[PDB]
Structures are given as C-alpha cells and as structure tokens.
C-alpha cells in the first residue's frame, strides 16, 4: 500500500502551460529522489526530469530544458511538473516514479495521466443505447452496451451499474472520427433471463468537459 497519485491532466492550448502532481502516500517521500516520465502514443518511454530528495537538485531532458520545472513539497508530500510552452508533440501520458535506493531504476510508478496538447475544444460525449435484441443474443446470454460519440480529448470512463457489474464487460478503444472527435462502445454480456428482472445502467464519465451521464439500457 505505497502509491503515487497523479492528477492535473487534460486538454491544453498550444503555447500554454499546465502542471501535475504526483502526490505520494505509502513511504517516507521526503528522502526519495523522484522523477517524471512521459510517453507519447505510438512511442515508448522517455525520461523528462529528475529531482533530488534535497529538492535542491534538478536535471532535465533536452526537449524540456528551460521550459519545464520539476519540484517538490515534502511537508505536503507532493511532486509537481510545471510545464510551459507546450507543443502538440508534448502530448503524452506522464508518469512520475520514485527512485530506488542504489539508485536510478524506478522503484514504484503512478498510473499515468494524459495531457493532450491541442487547440481544439472539449466537446462532451453523447451516450446512446445498444439495446439487447433477438439479434444481440446467443443462448443463455445476451449482449448490450452504450455507444459513446463524439468527444474530445482521448480519456473517458465507462463502468456498469456504478461498478456493481464488472465482468462480461469489454469497453473498446476510442477511434478518431474523421470529424476529429472520438467515439467508443462499451459492452457487457449478461445472463439472458435477467433481461426482465435486473436493470442495466452504464455510467459514462468524461472529465475534460464535466460531462457525466447514466444510460438505462433496456431490451427491444
């Protein structure tokens, strides 16, 4: 039960600036060299910068030198990345990670947070129902889902019946509409019989536009 918890992602104008925190719960943060690591999609891992436990020594990748500042607050238990002057290629998932004693591999990693650097605007998703149907049914099992067009940026989250239903589910990767917006399906295979008794609600959550929405899926 040691974890880093990043937050502060989402959409940024080109030319702008944005910062993220890698708040850290399990361990004595204050003594640990920390570092930040990004990864553009369709590419791999690149260090971004590293900071001393001291707080007093920083180092910087040559793509971000003079433009980004790594920093920490020991008493608040937190790591920051103030990024300036962002470019579309800065679009990446940023992870922060902590340095293992003896020292220079990364001991423990946060989950990632996606910064999408675009001058396009946020547009909240539309949620439609993939009703379960004679043509969506197979034996003692039946397929339903919610279709999620059209939204921008790339991260949305769908859970079923508020996280009560978690398996049978597949929620597919978005695809980039020719629009320039996104669309995804989420789908769960449930017990045939239950179609009448049980009731299925998909909960879509898109944070860039606070758009939250439920969708009662029902047969026919």
């Amino acid at each position: 039960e040691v974890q880093l918890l990043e937050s502060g992602g989402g959409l940024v104008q080109p030319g702008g600036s944005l910062r993220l925190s890698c708040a850290a719960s399990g361990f004595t943060f204050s003594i640990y060299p920390m570092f930040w690591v990004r990864q553009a999609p369709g590419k791999g891992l690149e260090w971004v910068s590293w900071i001393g436990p001291s707080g007093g020594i920083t180092k910087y990748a040559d793509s971000v030198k003079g433009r980004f500042t790594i920093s920490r607050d020991n008493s608040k238990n937190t790591l920051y990345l103030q990024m300036n002057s962002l470019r579309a290629e800065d679009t990446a998932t940023y992870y922060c990670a902590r340095e293992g004693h003896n020292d220079w591999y990364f001991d423990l990693w946060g989950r990632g947070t996606l910064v999408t650097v675009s001058s396009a605007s946020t547009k909240g998703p539309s949620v439609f129902p993939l009703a379960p149907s004679s043509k969506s049914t197979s034996g003692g099992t039946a397929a339903l889902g919610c279709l999620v067009k059209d939204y921008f940026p790339e991260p949305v989250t769908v859970s079923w019946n508020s996280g009560a239903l978690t398996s049978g589910v597949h929620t597919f990767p978005a695809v980039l509409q020719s629009s320039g917006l996104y669309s995804l399906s989420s789908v769960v295979t449930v017990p045939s019989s239950s179609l009448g008794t049980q009731t299925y609600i998909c909960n879509v959550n898109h944070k860039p536009s606070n758009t939250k929405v439920d969708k009662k899926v029902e047969p026919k």
Binding site: K59, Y105, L130, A131, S133, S136, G145, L147, L184
Partner: protein
C-alpha cells in the same frame, strides 16, 4: 546516449512455455539494467534491477540475466496474466534510456467470434445520423475481416473498427465495427448486413436486420 534495443519486438507464446526476451546495449552497460512490465493501461512495474536481481514480491518465474551489453529476461512458465510490454532500461551513464518494448502475446487455441449486430436507436436518429454497431466477441487469434453491406452493396464508406486487449483470463479478443451513415441515408436502404471472416470459422458469417 546509450541507446537500447529490445530483441524480438513481438512474441507470441502459448501459456505454459518459456519466454525469452533480449536487450542489447549500444556500448557496455555492465550490471546496470532494469526491467519493467507494463500491462495496459497501468503503471510500469519494476520486475528486475541490476540485470540479475529480482524485485521483491515479484513471482519467481520472472528472472533476468546477461551482463555487459547482452541481457535477457525470462518467464519460465508463460502464463495468461503475463501479456504486456516489457521494457529494459539502462542507467550506467547519464541520461537514463529505455528499450523499445517487446509485446508479449499469449498464443491460445482457435476460438471463433460470436457476432452480434446493433441497429441505431431512434434517439441517435433524432439527432441527425445513424451508427450500426457490429460486435465480435471472444475469439482468437486476432485477425478478422469485417465487411459491411447495405442491401447487399459492398461498403467502403464508412466504418471504423476497434479491438480490445487480450483477456488475461481466457486470452480472447473482442472487436467492434461501426458502420456510420447519415439518418438521411439510413432510411434509403432496406437490409443491414455485417459479414465476418475469421480462421476459427469454417466459412464466413453474416448478421443482418431490416429497416
């Protein structure tokens, strides 16, 4: 910048069998070599540091070895859980540098897709356009043709497919095509077919509906 390079790049192995991945250094790195695992989409997990040395709480099957400029991580019994990319990382000289990743996929036995079809929904139609969803569920392996037809007309306008990540449980994949046309056009045509070719099928399969 010691530039790292990971050997196979992809690897498909049946669960049960031994898996062997390489990491070649552009100049000697000695013992200083980390190994990470990244299941999707979560946080890379350290598996092995110092080349030889397994991280705590990591299962015994994972080990690493090599030294100098040739290094190998090993999964003595590949297992369905283990589908991920594996990164090796360098740390002998500054800056820190990573490999490219080898994606490891768990080869399982042929599984044919159960194919479903979802017409548009009214509500969607209320607002301008129509999506027809075609779901392919629980198959292996991943290759699958999917054409759309509209009154037996071959479409090249216009779907976008998407596939899931290998199931860690049963190693199967799912896919979904989406024929997308304007409501205007959706009403112009009588029958909506999607047809699936897949290796686990003796021949191809259509799913249709009318209206």
């Amino acid at each position: 910048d010691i530039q790292m390079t990971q050997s196979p790049g992809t690897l498909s192995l049946s669960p049960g069998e031994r898996a062997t991945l390489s990491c070649r250094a552009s100049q000697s790195v000695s013992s200083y070599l980390a190994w990470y695992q990244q299941k999707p989409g979560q946080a890379p997990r350290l598996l092995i540091y110092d080349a030889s040395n397994r991280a705590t709480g990591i299962p015994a099957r994972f080990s690493g070895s090599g030294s100098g400029t040739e290094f190998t991580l090993t999964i003595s019994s590949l297992q369905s859980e283990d589908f991920a990319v594996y990164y090796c990382q360098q740390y002998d000289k500054w800056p820190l540098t990573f490999g490219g990743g080898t994606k490891v996929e768990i080869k399982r036995t042929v599984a044919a897709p159960s194919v479903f079809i979802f017409p548009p929904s009214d509500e969607q139609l209320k607002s301008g356009t129509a999506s027809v969803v075609c779901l392919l569920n629980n198959f292996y392996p991943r290759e699958a043709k999917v054409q759309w037809k509209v009154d037996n007309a071959l479409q090249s306008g216009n779907s976008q497919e998407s596939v899931t990540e290998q199931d860690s449980k049963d190693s199967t994949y799912s896919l979904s095509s989406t024929l997308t046309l304007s409501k205007a056009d959706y009403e112009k045509h009588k029958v909506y077919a999607c047809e699936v070719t897949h290796q686990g099928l003796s021949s191809p399969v259509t799913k249709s509906f009318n209206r």
